[PDB]
Amino acid sequence: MVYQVKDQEDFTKQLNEAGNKLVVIDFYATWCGPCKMIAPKLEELSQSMSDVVFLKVDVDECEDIAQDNQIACMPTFLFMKNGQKLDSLSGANYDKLLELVEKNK
Amino acid sequence: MVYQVKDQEDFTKQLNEAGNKLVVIDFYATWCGPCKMIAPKLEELSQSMSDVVFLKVDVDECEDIAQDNQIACMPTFLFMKNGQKLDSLSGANYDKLLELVEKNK
Secondary structure (H helix, E strand, O other): OOEOOOHHHHHHHHHHHHHOOOHHHHHHHHOOOHHHHHHHHHHHHHOOOOOOOEEEEEEEOOHHHHHHOOEEOOOEEEEEEOOOOEEEEEEEOHHHHHHHHHHHO | OOOOOOHHHHHHHHHHOOOOOHHHHHHHHOOHHHHHHHHHHHHHHHHHHOOOOEEEEEEOHHHHHHOOOOOOOOEEEEEEEEEEEEEEEOOOOOHHHHHHHHHHO
């Protein structure tokens, strides 16, 4: 499952909820082609990988979060662990997403 | 000065208003840093280039137009003349933007 971050504080709840697990955050918009195209693959990955937390942020609904994270392209995948930023991936490159997961999990 | 396209009808309105002039449309978001930084430069160009029309589209406010234009990064600059698309530019690259303006105007 990919959880939908509601707001800043809901973001920070999920982050602290995640324990020591890698968190992957998909910054997206409903109107963005590449976002729609990769979302099912992220969903599938999330159903498999129980040792990783998958989250998503709708940039139009959570404009503040998008700004806080210096988002300029969609989708942007942010990789976090224990509140720390590990990596970031701009674009819908499935192989790079898997690499980055593999590296950071 | 750079006019903010309100909706799809208004977009058509501005395209018609522009006449034969090259039109530069800045697809932006209020939360996007690079968008904020280049916007004064655009106002400046708008103010100085009488043979070019500058417009802007807030992707959060005009999600339909964003989708129609396959926007994925901001800022994204669309170049139109007489209703026709001539060129596009992804990102806040002023020099390229300027090169495409001089090229198409």
